[PDB]
């Protein structure tokens, strides 16, 4: 209600189920009085590739290009490409970052993987040392709102695809927790293409419903046990 | 007769450790008499975004764009973009596909995620019921040759990053095994940037040596147990 939210959205079609989930999030968070910003990656033609065009100043080592080293320096020097710094400003100001996307190969679509690769650079999102619980984005919350082609049953320990929490590991732990985020439970909307119109409406309303009390939620314990068990 | 190998390579710098690993694989497999092809993604400025430009001609439903449906239809109608079909031909002809890349956020760099998203389309790499053990690329071998920033110790069951098999899941099981590939054990070159010059030349040498008997190797048992179990 007195918070800022950044929604990083990755779907090509406004009329899609992902489009609906993104829109209801904007509607509900706005109704609450929150400040809301959406980075619609495909509409922005967001650059996913990590290249030397991401640094505009003199390279530290112009003979052997190392993306991590050069972007870390460029961040400190303020010589990163502006599309990257534009996103960093949104993240810096946000209290909560919601990622809205369809699962592609049990991960994020490449345009969103590119956002992770390029925006969460050393110096901004983490440092060495300064990761996991000491990540630079500590104090901020993050939530993955994903949609799948597979059904919930397929995403179980005994299902063909295994438990859904397994594929969340690189994203929730390896990325968000690594950067210091407290991770809220994922919103997983299963197989909307298969579901009925009513079921679809039900999944949208369940997300809107959850958002009504999102600020009262506790984050998940982002650990190997939560993700894998035993 | 002999064997064909496709190396999908994702690094910006020819002089990099990844570059050396790619070059030694070409050298050794070429020496053995194998047919070798390399898709140098950054040099090709490979497009990572899944968009409507991936279909030439007219869409099956230009009212509501569904990437999966549209690319499935385009594959069947021979209407996919040429960058995608060029890669599919290389995959179709290959007996082994080696992916050479540095680990970015517990996964592949976005440009390689884009190759995965755009090249491995329904109808080409999988279908109903062609998936996992019956995936359409059955008969082919696949192998991940990854370099990391974190030490082998950090990637232990109780290490801060967790076991490496944890992040391998979405790639080995969710992607490669899903498409029918028999997955060979991953080649992990841990923290080459911190290692000594000789430890480095050592890691390169180990990879070249392993490649000497790559065709005698047996595919790992790609299962939830292999990745998380004991
Ligand atoms: C490259 C690629 C890789 C993939 N890999 C995976 C994977 O690893 N695992 C997996 O499980 N899936 C995978 N998928 C499938 C993908 O995750 C699903 O297609 C996606 O999650 C469905 O989301 P959508 O928004 O596109 O659905 P839509 O096609 O939009 O379908 C949802 C339906 O809901 C309707 N709808 C929209 N808004 C509303 C509303 N407000 N109320 C009611 N109905 C509404 C739509 O019109 C539509 O008919 C992959 C897809 C691609 C293209
Ligand atoms: C966006 C991003 C996200 C990342 N996320 C992760 C992550 O999730 N997990 C993680 O662990 N790390 C992560 N990293 C780190 C990354 O995985 C490592 O930086 C990368 O794997 C190192 O490989 P390289 O080829 O770039 O090394 P290089 O720096 O190119 O090479 C290391 C050294 O080897 C030397 N060398 C090259 N060839 C040879 C040879 N033939 N013999 C001897 N010496 C040689 C080089 O000159 C150099 O000094 C991330 C990096 C970035 C930029
Ligand atoms: C990995 O498992 C799945 C499961 C359900 C799915 N539905 C659709 C796709 C992929 C469709 N991509 C293209 C480019 O055509 C898919 C993959
Ligand atoms: C997990 O996320 C990341 C992201 C960008 C990165 N750059 C470099 C490293 C690892 C290098 N650290 C040590 C001391 O082993 C890294 C990790
Ligand atoms: Zn965690
Ligand atoms: Zn498997």
Coordinates of C-alpha atoms and ligand atoms in Angstrom, one line a residue:
Chain A
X1 CA 0.0 0.0 0.0
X2 CA 3.1 2.2 0.5
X3 CA 5.4 0.0 -1.5
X4 CA 7.0 -0.1 -4.9
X5 CA 6.6 -3.2 -7.2
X6 CA 8.4 -4.0 -10.4
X7 CA 6.9 -6.7 -12.6
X8 CA 9.4 -8.2 -15.1
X9 CA 7.1 -9.7 -17.8
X10 CA 8.0 -12.1 -20.6
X11 CA 5.3 -13.0 -23.0
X12 CA 4.8 -12.0 -26.6
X13 CA 1.0 -11.8 -26.5
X14 CA -1.1 -9.2 -24.5
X15 CA -4.1 -11.5 -24.8
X16 CA -2.3 -14.5 -23.3
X17 CA -2.9 -16.1 -20.0
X18 CA 0.4 -14.6 -18.8
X19 CA -0.8 -11.3 -20.1
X20 CA -3.9 -11.7 -17.8
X21 CA -1.9 -12.6 -14.8
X22 CA 0.3 -9.6 -15.3
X23 CA -2.7 -7.3 -15.8
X24 CA -4.5 -8.5 -12.7
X25 CA -1.3 -7.9 -10.7
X26 CA -1.1 -4.4 -12.0
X27 CA -4.9 -3.9 -11.3
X28 CA -4.8 -5.2 -7.7
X29 CA -1.5 -3.7 -6.6
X30 CA -2.6 -0.4 -8.1
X31 CA -6.0 -0.6 -6.3
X32 CA -4.0 -1.1 -3.1
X33 CA -2.2 2.2 -3.6
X34 CA 1.2 0.6 -4.5
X35 CA 3.5 2.1 -7.0
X36 CA 3.8 -0.3 -10.0
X37 CA 6.2 -0.5 -12.9
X38 CA 6.2 -3.2 -15.6
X39 CA 9.2 -4.1 -17.8
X40 CA 7.4 -5.8 -20.8
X41 CA 10.6 -7.4 -22.2
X42 CA 9.3 -8.4 -25.7
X43 CA 7.6 -5.0 -26.2
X44 CA 10.9 -3.4 -25.2
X45 CA 12.8 -5.7 -27.7
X46 CA 15.0 -6.2 -24.6
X47 CA 18.6 -7.3 -25.6
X48 CA 19.3 -10.8 -24.1
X49 CA 22.9 -11.2 -25.2
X50 CA 25.8 -10.5 -22.9
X51 CA 28.3 -8.7 -25.2
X52 CA 31.0 -6.1 -25.3
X53 CA 28.4 -3.6 -26.4
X54 CA 27.2 -3.6 -22.8
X55 CA 30.2 -1.5 -21.8
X56 CA 30.8 1.9 -23.4
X57 CA 34.0 3.0 -21.7
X58 CA 37.7 1.9 -22.0
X59 CA 37.9 -1.8 -21.3
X60 CA 40.0 -3.0 -18.4
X61 CA 41.5 -5.7 -20.5
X62 CA 40.9 -5.0 -24.2
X63 CA 42.9 -8.0 -25.3
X64 CA 40.9 -10.8 -23.7
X65 CA 37.3 -9.9 -23.1
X66 CA 35.8 -11.2 -19.8
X67 CA 32.1 -10.1 -19.5
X68 CA 31.9 -10.5 -15.7
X69 CA 35.1 -8.4 -15.1
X70 CA 34.2 -5.8 -17.6
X71 CA 30.6 -5.3 -16.5
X72 CA 31.7 -5.2 -12.8
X73 CA 34.2 -2.4 -13.6
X74 CA 31.7 -0.6 -15.9
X75 CA 29.1 -0.6 -13.1
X76 CA 31.6 1.1 -10.8
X77 CA 32.6 3.5 -13.5
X78 CA 29.0 4.2 -14.7
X79 CA 29.8 3.1 -18.2
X80 CA 27.2 0.3 -18.6
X81 CA 24.8 0.5 -21.5
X82 CA 21.7 2.5 -20.5
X83 CA 19.2 -0.3 -21.1
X84 CA 20.9 -2.1 -18.2
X85 CA 21.1 0.9 -15.9
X86 CA 17.4 1.7 -16.7
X87 CA 16.5 -1.8 -15.3
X88 CA 18.8 -1.4 -12.3
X89 CA 17.0 1.8 -11.3
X90 CA 13.7 0.0 -11.4
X91 CA 15.0 -2.9 -9.2
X92 CA 16.8 -0.5 -6.8
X93 CA 13.6 1.3 -6.1
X94 CA 11.4 -1.7 -5.9
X95 CA 10.3 -3.4 -2.6
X96 CA 9.0 -6.4 -4.5
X97 CA 10.0 -7.8 -7.9
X98 CA 7.5 -10.2 -9.5
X99 CA 8.7 -12.2 -12.6
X100 CA 5.7 -13.2 -14.8
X101 CA 6.6 -15.8 -17.5
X102 CA 5.7 -19.1 -19.1
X103 CA 8.2 -21.9 -18.3
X104 CA 10.5 -22.6 -21.3
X105 CA 12.6 -25.7 -20.8
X106 CA 11.9 -25.7 -17.1
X107 CA 13.4 -22.3 -16.8
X108 CA 12.8 -18.7 -17.9
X109 CA 12.4 -17.7 -21.6
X110 CA 15.8 -16.5 -23.0
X111 CA 14.7 -12.9 -23.1
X112 CA 14.2 -13.0 -19.4
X113 CA 17.3 -15.1 -18.8
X114 CA 19.1 -12.2 -20.6
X115 CA 17.6 -9.7 -18.2
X116 CA 19.0 -11.8 -15.3
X117 CA 22.4 -12.1 -17.0
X118 CA 22.8 -8.4 -17.9
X119 CA 21.0 -6.5 -15.1
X120 CA 22.2 -8.5 -12.1
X121 CA 25.9 -7.6 -12.4
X122 CA 28.6 -7.7 -9.8
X123 CA 28.7 -4.5 -7.8
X124 CA 24.9 -4.0 -8.2
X125 CA 23.3 -7.3 -7.3
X126 CA 26.1 -9.1 -5.5
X127 CA 29.8 -8.7 -4.8
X128 CA 32.5 -11.2 -3.8
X129 CA 32.1 -11.3 -0.9
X130 CA 28.5 -10.2 -0.6
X131 CA 26.1 -12.9 -1.8
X132 CA 23.3 -15.2 -0.6
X133 CA 22.2 -13.8 2.8
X134 CA 24.7 -10.9 2.3
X135 CA 23.6 -10.2 -1.3
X136 CA 23.3 -6.5 -2.4
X137 CA 19.5 -6.7 -2.9
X138 CA 18.8 -7.7 0.7
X139 CA 15.7 -6.2 2.1
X140 CA 13.9 -6.8 -1.2
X141 CA 11.3 -9.5 -1.9
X142 CA 11.1 -11.5 -5.2
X143 CA 8.4 -13.9 -6.5
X144 CA 8.2 -16.1 -9.5
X145 CA 4.7 -16.3 -11.1
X146 CA 5.1 -19.1 -13.7
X147 CA 2.7 -20.9 -16.1
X148 CA 3.3 -24.4 -17.4
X149 CA 2.4 -26.6 -20.3
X150 CA 2.5 -29.7 -18.1
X151 CA -0.1 -30.5 -15.4
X152 CA 0.4 -30.4 -11.7
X153 CA 0.4 -34.2 -11.6
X154 CA 3.3 -34.3 -14.1
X155 CA 5.2 -32.0 -11.8
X156 CA 5.3 -34.3 -8.7
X157 CA 8.1 -36.4 -7.3
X158 CA 6.5 -39.4 -9.1
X159 CA 5.4 -37.4 -12.1
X160 CA 7.3 -37.5 -15.4
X161 CA 8.7 -34.0 -15.0
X162 CA 9.6 -34.4 -11.3
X163 CA 8.5 -32.0 -8.5
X164 CA 8.0 -28.4 -9.6
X165 CA 10.4 -27.2 -6.8
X166 CA 13.3 -29.0 -8.5
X167 CA 13.3 -26.6 -11.5
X168 CA 12.9 -23.6 -9.2
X169 CA 16.4 -24.1 -7.7
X170 CA 18.6 -22.2 -10.2
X171 CA 16.1 -19.3 -10.2
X172 CA 15.1 -19.1 -6.5
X173 CA 18.3 -20.1 -4.9
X174 CA 21.0 -19.7 -7.6
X175 CA 19.8 -16.3 -8.7
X176 CA 17.3 -14.5 -6.4
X177 CA 18.6 -15.7 -3.0
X178 CA 22.2 -15.3 -4.3
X179 CA 21.5 -11.6 -4.9
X180 CA 20.1 -11.2 -1.4
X181 CA 16.4 -11.3 -2.2
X182 CA 13.9 -12.9 0.3
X183 CA 11.9 -15.2 -1.9
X184 CA 8.1 -15.5 -1.6
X185 CA 6.4 -18.8 -2.5
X186 CA 6.1 -19.2 -6.3
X187 CA 2.7 -18.8 -7.9
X188 CA 2.4 -21.7 -10.3
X189 CA -0.5 -21.7 -12.7
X190 CA -0.6 -25.2 -14.2
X191 CA -1.5 -26.0 -17.8
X192 CA -3.9 -23.1 -18.7
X193 CA -4.0 -24.2 -22.3
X194 CA -5.5 -27.5 -21.1
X195 CA -7.7 -26.1 -18.4
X196 CA -11.2 -25.0 -19.0
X197 CA -12.3 -21.3 -19.4
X198 CA -13.7 -21.5 -15.8
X199 CA -10.5 -23.1 -14.5
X200 CA -8.5 -20.3 -16.2
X201 CA -10.7 -17.6 -14.6
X202 CA -10.2 -19.4 -11.4
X203 CA -6.4 -19.3 -11.6
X204 CA -6.4 -15.6 -12.5
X205 CA -8.7 -14.8 -9.5
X206 CA -6.6 -17.0 -7.2
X207 CA -3.5 -14.8 -8.1
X208 CA -5.5 -11.6 -7.7
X209 CA -6.8 -13.0 -4.3
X210 CA -3.3 -13.9 -3.1
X211 CA -2.0 -10.4 -4.0
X212 CA -4.6 -8.9 -1.7
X213 CA -2.5 -10.1 1.3
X214 CA 1.0 -10.4 -0.3
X215 CA 2.6 -7.9 2.1
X216 CA 1.7 -10.1 5.1
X217 CA 3.4 -13.2 3.7
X218 CA 6.7 -14.6 5.0
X219 CA 9.4 -15.7 2.5
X220 CA 10.1 -19.4 2.0
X221 CA 13.2 -20.9 3.6
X222 CA 15.2 -20.9 0.3
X223 CA 17.3 -24.0 1.1
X224 CA 18.1 -27.4 -0.5
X225 CA 15.7 -29.1 1.9
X226 CA 12.7 -26.9 0.8
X227 CA 13.6 -27.6 -2.8
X228 CA 14.5 -31.3 -2.7
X229 CA 13.4 -32.7 0.7
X230 CA 14.9 -35.3 3.0
Chain B
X1 CA 30.6 -45.2 -41.2
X2 CA 32.1 -42.5 -39.0
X3 CA 30.5 -40.0 -36.6
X4 CA 29.2 -36.4 -36.8
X5 CA 29.5 -33.9 -33.9
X6 CA 28.0 -30.5 -33.5
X7 CA 29.5 -28.2 -30.9
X8 CA 27.1 -25.4 -29.8
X9 CA 29.5 -22.8 -28.3
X10 CA 28.6 -19.8 -26.2
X11 CA 31.5 -17.5 -25.3
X12 CA 32.4 -14.0 -26.5
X13 CA 36.1 -14.4 -26.5
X14 CA 38.2 -16.7 -28.7
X15 CA 41.1 -16.6 -26.2
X16 CA 39.0 -17.7 -23.3
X17 CA 39.2 -20.9 -21.4
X18 CA 35.8 -21.9 -23.0
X19 CA 37.4 -21.0 -26.4
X20 CA 40.3 -23.3 -25.6
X21 CA 38.0 -26.2 -24.6
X22 CA 36.0 -25.7 -27.8
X23 CA 39.2 -25.6 -29.9
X24 CA 40.7 -28.8 -28.3
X25 CA 37.4 -30.6 -28.9
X26 CA 37.5 -29.6 -32.6
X27 CA 41.2 -30.6 -32.8
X28 CA 40.8 -34.0 -31.1
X29 CA 37.5 -35.0 -32.8
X30 CA 38.9 -33.8 -36.2
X31 CA 42.1 -36.0 -35.5
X32 CA 39.9 -39.0 -34.9
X33 CA 38.3 -38.6 -38.3
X34 CA 34.9 -37.3 -37.1
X35 CA 32.9 -34.8 -39.0
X36 CA 32.8 -31.6 -36.9
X37 CA 30.6 -28.5 -37.0
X38 CA 30.6 -25.5 -34.6
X39 CA 27.8 -23.1 -34.0
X40 CA 29.7 -20.1 -32.5
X41 CA 26.5 -18.3 -31.2
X42 CA 28.0 -14.9 -30.4
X43 CA 29.9 -14.8 -33.7
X44 CA 26.7 -15.6 -35.4
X45 CA 24.9 -12.9 -33.4
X46 CA 22.4 -15.7 -32.8
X47 CA 18.9 -14.4 -32.1
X48 CA 17.8 -15.6 -28.6
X49 CA 14.2 -14.1 -28.5
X50 CA 11.2 -16.4 -29.3
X51 CA 9.1 -14.1 -31.5
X52 CA 6.7 -14.1 -34.4
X53 CA 9.6 -13.4 -36.8
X54 CA 10.5 -17.1 -36.3
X55 CA 7.7 -18.0 -38.7
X56 CA 7.8 -16.9 -42.3
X57 CA 4.6 -16.5 -44.3
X58 CA 1.3 -16.3 -42.5
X59 CA 0.5 -17.4 -38.9
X60 CA -2.0 -20.1 -38.1
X61 CA -3.8 -17.6 -35.8
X62 CA -2.7 -14.0 -36.3
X63 CA -5.3 -12.8 -33.7
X64 CA -3.6 -14.4 -30.7
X65 CA 0.0 -15.3 -31.0
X66 CA 1.0 -18.7 -29.4
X67 CA 4.7 -19.3 -30.0
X68 CA 4.6 -23.1 -29.3
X69 CA 1.6 -23.7 -31.6
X70 CA 2.9 -21.4 -34.3
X71 CA 6.4 -22.9 -34.4
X72 CA 5.0 -26.5 -34.3
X73 CA 2.8 -25.6 -37.4
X74 CA 5.7 -23.8 -39.1
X75 CA 8.0 -26.8 -38.6
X76 CA 5.4 -29.1 -40.3
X77 CA 4.9 -26.5 -43.1
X78 CA 8.6 -25.9 -43.6
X79 CA 8.0 -22.2 -42.7
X80 CA 10.5 -21.6 -39.9
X81 CA 13.1 -18.9 -40.1
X82 CA 16.3 -20.0 -41.8
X83 CA 18.5 -19.4 -38.7
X84 CA 16.4 -22.0 -36.9
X85 CA 16.3 -24.5 -39.8
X86 CA 20.0 -24.2 -40.3
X87 CA 20.6 -25.2 -36.7
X88 CA 18.0 -28.1 -37.0
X89 CA 19.9 -29.5 -40.0
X90 CA 23.1 -29.6 -38.0
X91 CA 21.3 -31.3 -35.0
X92 CA 19.5 -33.8 -37.3
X93 CA 22.8 -34.9 -38.9
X94 CA 24.8 -35.0 -35.6
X95 CA 25.5 -38.2 -33.6
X96 CA 26.8 -36.1 -30.7
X97 CA 26.0 -32.5 -29.6
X98 CA 28.4 -30.9 -27.2
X99 CA 27.3 -27.6 -25.5
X100 CA 30.4 -25.5 -24.4
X101 CA 29.6 -22.6 -22.2
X102 CA 30.3 -20.8 -18.9
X103 CA 27.7 -21.2 -16.2
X104 CA 25.5 -18.0 -16.0
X105 CA 23.1 -18.0 -13.0
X106 CA 23.1 -21.8 -12.5
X107 CA 22.3 -22.3 -16.2
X108 CA 23.2 -21.5 -19.8
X109 CA 24.0 -17.9 -21.0
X110 CA 20.8 -16.4 -22.5
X111 CA 22.1 -16.6 -26.1
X112 CA 22.4 -20.5 -25.7
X113 CA 19.0 -20.6 -23.8
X114 CA 17.6 -18.9 -26.9
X115 CA 19.1 -21.6 -29.2
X116 CA 17.4 -24.1 -26.9
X117 CA 14.1 -22.3 -27.0
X118 CA 14.0 -21.7 -30.7
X119 CA 15.8 -24.7 -32.3
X120 CA 14.3 -27.5 -30.2
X121 CA 10.7 -27.0 -31.3
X122 CA 7.7 -29.3 -31.2
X123 CA 7.7 -31.6 -34.2
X124 CA 11.5 -31.5 -34.4
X125 CA 12.8 -32.4 -30.9
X126 CA 9.7 -33.7 -29.3
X127 CA 6.0 -34.3 -29.8
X128 CA 3.1 -36.4 -28.3
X129 CA 4.3 -39.1 -27.4
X130 CA 7.9 -38.5 -28.5
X131 CA 9.5 -37.3 -25.3
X132 CA 12.1 -38.3 -22.6
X133 CA 13.0 -41.9 -23.6
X134 CA 11.0 -41.6 -26.9
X135 CA 12.0 -38.0 -27.6
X136 CA 12.5 -37.4 -31.3
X137 CA 16.3 -37.0 -31.1
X138 CA 16.6 -40.5 -29.7
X139 CA 19.8 -42.2 -30.8
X140 CA 21.8 -39.0 -30.4
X141 CA 24.3 -38.3 -27.6
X142 CA 24.4 -34.9 -25.8
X143 CA 27.0 -33.5 -23.4
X144 CA 27.3 -30.4 -21.3
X145 CA 30.9 -29.0 -21.0
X146 CA 30.5 -26.2 -18.5
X147 CA 33.0 -23.9 -16.8
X148 CA 32.1 -22.3 -13.5
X149 CA 33.1 -19.3 -11.3
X150 CA 32.5 -21.2 -8.1
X151 CA 34.8 -23.9 -6.7
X152 CA 34.1 -27.6 -6.6
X153 CA 33.8 -27.3 -2.8
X154 CA 31.0 -24.7 -3.2
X155 CA 29.1 -27.2 -5.4
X156 CA 28.9 -30.0 -2.7
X157 CA 25.7 -31.3 -1.2
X158 CA 26.1 -29.1 1.8
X159 CA 28.1 -26.4 0.0
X160 CA 26.6 -22.9 -0.4
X161 CA 25.7 -23.6 -4.1
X162 CA 24.5 -27.1 -3.5
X163 CA 25.4 -30.1 -5.6
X164 CA 26.1 -29.4 -9.3
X165 CA 23.5 -32.1 -10.2
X166 CA 21.0 -29.8 -8.7
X167 CA 21.4 -27.1 -11.4
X168 CA 22.0 -29.7 -14.1
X169 CA 18.4 -30.9 -13.8
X170 CA 16.6 -28.4 -16.0
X171 CA 19.3 -28.9 -18.7
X172 CA 20.1 -32.6 -18.6
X173 CA 16.7 -33.9 -17.7
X174 CA 14.3 -31.2 -18.5
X175 CA 15.8 -30.4 -21.9
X176 CA 18.2 -33.0 -23.3
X177 CA 16.6 -36.2 -22.0
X178 CA 13.2 -34.7 -22.7
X179 CA 14.2 -34.5 -26.4
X180 CA 15.4 -38.1 -26.5
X181 CA 19.1 -37.5 -26.1
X182 CA 21.2 -40.0 -24.2
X183 CA 23.1 -37.7 -21.9
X184 CA 26.8 -38.3 -21.3
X185 CA 28.3 -37.2 -18.0
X186 CA 28.9 -33.5 -17.8
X187 CA 32.4 -32.1 -18.2
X188 CA 32.8 -29.5 -15.4
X189 CA 35.9 -27.3 -15.4
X190 CA 35.7 -25.7 -12.0
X191 CA 36.8 -22.1 -11.4
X192 CA 39.4 -21.9 -14.3
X193 CA 39.9 -18.1 -13.6
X194 CA 41.3 -18.8 -10.1
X195 CA 43.3 -21.9 -11.0
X196 CA 47.0 -21.9 -11.8
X197 CA 48.3 -21.8 -15.4
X198 CA 49.2 -25.5 -15.2
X199 CA 46.0 -26.5 -13.5
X200 CA 44.3 -24.8 -16.4
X201 CA 46.3 -26.5 -19.1
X202 CA 45.6 -29.6 -17.0
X203 CA 41.8 -29.1 -17.3
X204 CA 42.1 -28.6 -21.0
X205 CA 44.2 -31.7 -21.3
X206 CA 41.7 -33.8 -19.3
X207 CA 39.0 -32.8 -21.7
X208 CA 41.1 -33.7 -24.7
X209 CA 41.9 -37.1 -23.1
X210 CA 38.3 -37.8 -22.3
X211 CA 37.3 -37.0 -25.9
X212 CA 39.7 -39.8 -27.0
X213 CA 37.2 -42.4 -25.7
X214 CA 34.0 -40.4 -25.9
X215 CA 32.3 -43.0 -28.2
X216 CA 33.0 -45.8 -25.7
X217 CA 31.1 -44.0 -22.9
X218 CA 27.7 -45.0 -21.5
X219 CA 24.9 -42.5 -21.1
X220 CA 24.2 -41.5 -17.5
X221 CA 20.9 -42.7 -15.9
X222 CA 19.0 -39.4 -16.4
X223 CA 16.6 -39.6 -13.4
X224 CA 15.6 -37.6 -10.4
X225 CA 17.6 -40.0 -8.3
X226 CA 20.8 -39.4 -10.3
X227 CA 20.5 -35.6 -9.8
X228 CA 19.2 -35.4 -6.2
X229 CA 19.1 -38.9 -4.8
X230 CA 21.9 -40.9 -3.1
Ligands
LIG1 C1 10.2 -22.7 -26.2 C2 9.1 -23.3 -25.3 C3 9.5 -24.2 -24.3 C4 8.6 -24.7 -23.3 N1 9.1 -25.6 -22.3 C5 8.2 -26.0 -21.3 C6 8.6 -26.6 -20.1 O1 9.8 -26.8 -19.9 N2 7.7 -27.1 -19.2 C7 6.3 -27.0 -19.4 O2 5.5 -27.5 -18.6 N3 5.8 -26.2 -20.4 C8 6.8 -25.7 -21.4 N4 6.3 -24.9 -22.4 C9 4.8 -24.6 -22.4 C10 4.5 -23.2 -21.9 O3 5.1 -23.2 -20.5 C11 3.0 -22.9 -21.9 O4 2.7 -22.9 -23.3 C12 2.7 -21.6 -21.2 O5 3.0 -21.8 -19.8 C13 1.2 -21.3 -21.3 O6 1.0 -19.9 -21.0 P1 0.3 -18.9 -22.0 O7 0.2 -17.6 -21.4 O8 1.1 -18.8 -23.3 O9 -1.1 -19.6 -22.4 P2 -2.2 -19.4 -23.5 O10 -1.9 -20.0 -24.8 O11 -2.6 -17.9 -23.5 O12 -3.4 -20.3 -22.9 C14 -4.2 -20.0 -21.8 C15 -5.7 -19.9 -22.3 O13 -6.3 -19.0 -21.3 C16 -7.0 -18.0 -22.0 N5 -7.0 -16.8 -21.2 C17 -6.2 -15.7 -21.2 N6 -6.4 -14.8 -20.2 C18 -7.5 -15.3 -19.6 C19 -8.4 -14.8 -18.5 N7 -8.2 -13.6 -18.0 N8 -9.4 -15.6 -18.1 C20 -9.7 -16.8 -18.7 N9 -9.0 -17.4 -19.7 C21 -7.9 -16.5 -20.1 C22 -6.3 -17.8 -23.4 O14 -7.1 -17.2 -24.3 C23 -5.9 -19.3 -23.7 O15 -6.8 -20.0 -24.5 C24 7.2 -24.4 -23.4 C25 6.8 -23.5 -24.4 C26 7.7 -23.0 -25.4 C27 7.1 -22.2 -26.5
LIG2 C1 26.1 -13.2 -16.2 C2 27.1 -14.1 -15.4 C3 26.5 -15.0 -14.5 C4 27.3 -16.0 -13.8 N1 26.7 -16.9 -12.9 C5 27.5 -18.0 -12.4 C6 26.9 -19.1 -11.8 O1 25.6 -19.2 -11.7 N2 27.7 -20.0 -11.1 C7 29.1 -19.9 -11.2 O2 29.8 -20.8 -10.5 N3 29.7 -18.9 -11.9 C8 28.9 -18.0 -12.6 N4 29.5 -17.1 -13.4 C9 31.0 -17.2 -13.6 C10 31.3 -17.9 -14.9 O3 30.7 -19.2 -14.9 C11 32.8 -18.0 -15.1 O4 33.3 -16.7 -15.1 C12 33.3 -18.8 -16.4 O5 32.8 -20.1 -16.2 C13 34.8 -18.8 -16.6 O6 35.1 -19.3 -17.9 P1 35.9 -18.5 -19.0 O7 36.0 -19.2 -20.2 O8 35.1 -17.1 -19.1 O9 37.3 -18.1 -18.3 P2 38.5 -17.2 -18.7 O10 38.6 -16.1 -17.7 O11 38.4 -17.0 -20.1 O12 39.8 -18.2 -18.4 C14 40.4 -18.4 -17.1 C15 41.9 -18.3 -17.3 O13 42.3 -19.4 -18.2 C16 43.2 -18.9 -19.2 N5 43.2 -19.8 -20.3 C17 42.5 -19.8 -21.5 N6 42.7 -20.8 -22.3 C18 43.7 -21.6 -21.6 C19 44.3 -22.8 -21.9 N7 44.1 -23.5 -23.1 N8 45.2 -23.3 -21.0 C20 45.6 -22.5 -19.9 N9 45.0 -21.3 -19.6 C21 44.0 -20.9 -20.4 C22 42.7 -17.4 -19.5 O14 43.6 -16.6 -20.2 C23 42.3 -17.0 -18.1 O15 43.3 -16.3 -17.4 C24 28.7 -16.0 -14.1 C25 29.3 -15.1 -14.9 C26 28.5 -14.1 -15.6 C27 29.2 -13.1 -16.5
LIG3 C1 9.8 -29.5 -21.9 O1 8.4 -29.9 -21.8 C2 7.5 -29.3 -22.6 C3 6.1 -29.5 -22.1 C4 5.0 -28.9 -22.8 C5 5.2 -28.1 -23.9 N1 4.3 -27.5 -24.7 C6 5.0 -26.8 -25.7 C7 6.4 -27.0 -25.6 C8 7.5 -26.5 -26.4 C9 7.1 -25.8 -27.7 N2 8.2 -25.0 -28.3 C10 8.3 -24.8 -29.6 C11 9.5 -23.9 -30.0 O2 7.6 -25.2 -30.4 C12 6.5 -27.9 -24.4 C13 7.7 -28.4 -23.8
LIG4 C1 26.2 -17.3 -8.8 O1 26.2 -16.0 -9.4 C2 27.4 -15.5 -9.8 C3 27.3 -14.5 -10.7 C4 28.4 -13.8 -11.3 C5 29.7 -14.3 -11.0 N1 30.9 -13.9 -11.4 C6 31.8 -14.7 -10.8 C7 31.2 -15.6 -10.0 C8 31.8 -16.7 -9.1 C9 33.2 -16.4 -8.6 N2 33.3 -16.4 -7.2 C10 34.2 -17.2 -6.5 C11 35.0 -16.5 -5.4 O2 34.2 -18.4 -6.6 C12 29.8 -15.4 -10.1 C13 28.7 -16.0 -9.5
LIG5 ZN1 18.1 -20.2 -1.4
LIG6 ZN1 16.5 -37.5 -17.3

